[PDB]
């Protein structure tokens, strides 16, 4: 359930 890297486009 780990979200994408915070440094990545959201």
């Amino acid at each position, epitope marked *: 359930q780990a979200p994408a890297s*915070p440094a990545a486009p959201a």
Partner: antibody
Amino acid sequence: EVKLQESGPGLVAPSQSLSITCTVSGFSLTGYGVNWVRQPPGKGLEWLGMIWGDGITDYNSALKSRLSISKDNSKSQVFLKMNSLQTDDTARYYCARDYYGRRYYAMDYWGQGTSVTVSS
Amino acid sequence: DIELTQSPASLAVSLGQRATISCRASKSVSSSGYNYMFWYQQKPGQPPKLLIYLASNLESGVPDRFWGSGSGTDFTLNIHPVEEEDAATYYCQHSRELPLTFGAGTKLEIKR
């Protein structure tokens, strides 16, 4: 069968340009993002930038003014171009796929790399 | 810009004993209860190979002998028992903000 292979000149003169091509197979560039990472001989790893599936392109802020990253989904090619080359841009240049396409901004599959020296 | 300080720069360990490598971040690399921290092994003439993702998860096909731990700004890579084929340079990286940075690496010598 996931593969990536870098290709480029090997030698470039100072203040000139550098063009490298990363050729991929076993996956679509529409779904996975691809990074450029370089390693100066003797030293360690420096992240250059990333081009995601959708086309969003991220650069290392310290070199953004000299870097250009593009791709062609249909030909399975990712491109890097660097201007105003100085001697300490001498390194092995790698392309690495986004780890499992989960967007954790880590790397699973790398190419073997392409060596570049900057000298007249 | 986050810095990662890896220690020690080089390390010698005896076959069958334990190797402990440290990675210290200049800011927390935690978000939503996950630590955006990764470990690679680089042998000569080869590219780096991910062993650990998200601080503590073991990549499939990598032996039980490797494990990562830590959180916030203090992370560790442990090997036990150390084998001959573990002779390599180990690197940490984070993805908390941009740009992505790496540690300067830890070179592991195998004593015999």
